[PDB]
Design a protein around this nucleic acid. Structure first.
Ligand code: MG
Ligand code: MG
Ligand code: MG
Ligand code: MG
Ligand code: MG
Ligand code: MG
Ligand code: MG
Ligand code: MG
Ligand code: MG
Length: 49
RNA sequence: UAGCUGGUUCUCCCCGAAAUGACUUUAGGGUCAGCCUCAGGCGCUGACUGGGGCCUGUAGAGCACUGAUAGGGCUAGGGGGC
């Protein structure tokens, strides 16, 4: 048993998503689409009705 | 600060919307619902269809009600002549 393959347990796969792409998540971000998708939105739990 | 405008970069595979309601100093913004997607459940219930009951007041029609209406009749009221 050596440093080759004590590797992660076929499922802790660290893999964040990247939203600059061209195929995946693209012009807009992961989501987005629109406006008030920018720096924040009021709360939105407790707050904004 | 910017509920505004602009920009957001590799690939292939599956699914795939919405532009509606409610409230909103809300109306090109939002919150919950609606529609999309993923995971774990349940398992013939699903759209569509057959048969069966119930429920309805449109199209049409009708004048019995509410009103409207032309012609005539009979007929109170009025106006005119002896
Ligand atoms: Mg902001
Ligand atoms: Mg498809
Ligand atoms: Mg307006
Ligand atoms: Mg606005
Ligand atoms: Mg059923
Ligand atoms: Mg009649
Ligand atoms: Mg007459
Ligand atoms: Mg007459
Ligand atoms: Mg006279």
């Amino acid at each position: 048993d050596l440093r080759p393959n004590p590797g992660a347990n076929k499922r802790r796969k660290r893999v964040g998503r990247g939203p600059g792409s061209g195929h995946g998540k693209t012009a807009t971000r992961g989501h987005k689409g629109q406006k008030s998708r920018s720096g924040g939105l009021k709360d939105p739990r407790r707050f904004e009705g």
